[PDB]
Amino acid sequence: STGSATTTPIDSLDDAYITPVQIGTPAQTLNLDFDTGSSDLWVFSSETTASEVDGQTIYTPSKSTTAKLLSGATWSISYGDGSSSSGDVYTDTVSVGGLTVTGQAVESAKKVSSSFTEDSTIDGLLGLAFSTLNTVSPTQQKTFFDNAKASLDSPVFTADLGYHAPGTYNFGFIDTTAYTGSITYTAVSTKQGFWEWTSTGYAVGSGTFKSTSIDGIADTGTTLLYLPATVVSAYWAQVSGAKSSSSVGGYVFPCSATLPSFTFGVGSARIVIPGDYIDFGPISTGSSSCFGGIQSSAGIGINIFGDVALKAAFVVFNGATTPTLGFASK
Numbered sequence: 292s293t294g295s296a297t298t299t300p301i302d303s304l305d306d307a308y309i310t311p312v313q314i315g316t317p318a319q320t321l322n323l324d325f326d327t328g329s330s331d332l333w334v335f336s337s338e339t340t341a342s343e344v345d346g347q348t349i350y351t352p353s354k355s356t357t358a359k360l361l362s363g364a365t366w367s368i369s370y371g372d373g374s375s376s377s378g379d380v381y382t383d384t385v386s387v388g389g390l391t392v393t394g395q396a397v398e399s400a401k402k403v404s405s406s407f408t409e410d411s412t413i414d415g416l417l418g419l420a421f422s423t424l425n426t427v428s429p430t431q432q433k434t435f436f437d438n439a440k441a442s443l444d445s446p447v448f449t450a451d452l453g454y455h456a457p458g459t460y461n462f463g464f465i466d467t468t469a470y471t472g473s474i475t476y477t478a479v480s481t482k483q484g485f486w487e488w489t490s491t492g493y494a495v496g497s498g499t500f501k502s503t504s505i506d507g508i509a510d511t512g513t514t515l516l517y518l519p520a521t522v523v524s525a526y527w528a529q530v531s532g533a534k535s536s537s538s539v540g541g542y543v544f545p546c547s548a549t550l551p552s553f554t555f556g557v558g559s560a561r562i563v564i565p566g567d568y569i570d571f572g573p574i575s576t577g578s579s580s581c582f583g584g585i586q587s588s589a590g591i592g593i594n595i596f597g598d599v600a601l602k603a604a605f606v607v608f609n610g611a612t613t614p615t616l617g618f619a620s621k
Contacts, residue, residue: 296459312417331398485508530545530551539574
């Protein structure tokens, strides 16, 4: 089997992407944030504290003839950005772009933190990291991909995120029309439960490539590109007037600037992030100070190849017995 679904930016900055997901019988369609950095499929629901729901579409398990309470199971997750959610668990039928999993754990939120409430466009998350990170207790549950894998034509999914435009998540096949050149594959460590890999280096604008190993995670659920302070300083040094602002929470730059590109290495291959992908707009409405899309990972504890990086590539998440990651230009 295969599946193919369009993923759409939630706003004009590509702060996140939503993908429609069918849950239950009859189908209840929710727009979920596909997140290769976590491993829980959780949704706003009829059980979510009413004051914490503000415009989201909810899953109502009592209206699904295939929903079953997973007795005794609870979940609770906290994300790198400080947001969180928790609740109980149902199993139900879940379909993405024509690909159906029966008995998928659907984690129903009883509580969500303010950042979730305040984002009306995201109805929940669909985790695509390794199932070892799933938070369901006392019996850990499998991700949608893990459940689907054996049925897929090939045990893979691909992320093709757009810049200020829709893109695609495919399951079970590689669309050879969706990229240019070849896909370069690179080793993955699953030791921390992430799609963790090592970039071979970087360049800033038309500058020379610096060969250096940068371990980090391919994370569709993180907006920005978080890299070591040395790398980030080298980038922003090429933007007149750019500076790190403790008050704002990272590098800012004059909105009048033209940003240089940023290149990262995948083996001997190179992925070029155009300068415009690195612009996240005014820090507050009407400001001429703009927020940068490349930020330091110092104090995160890990480097994160988030959407800023991934949307410059066609990315293969290869869930073979030994997982690997592939990157192609597009």
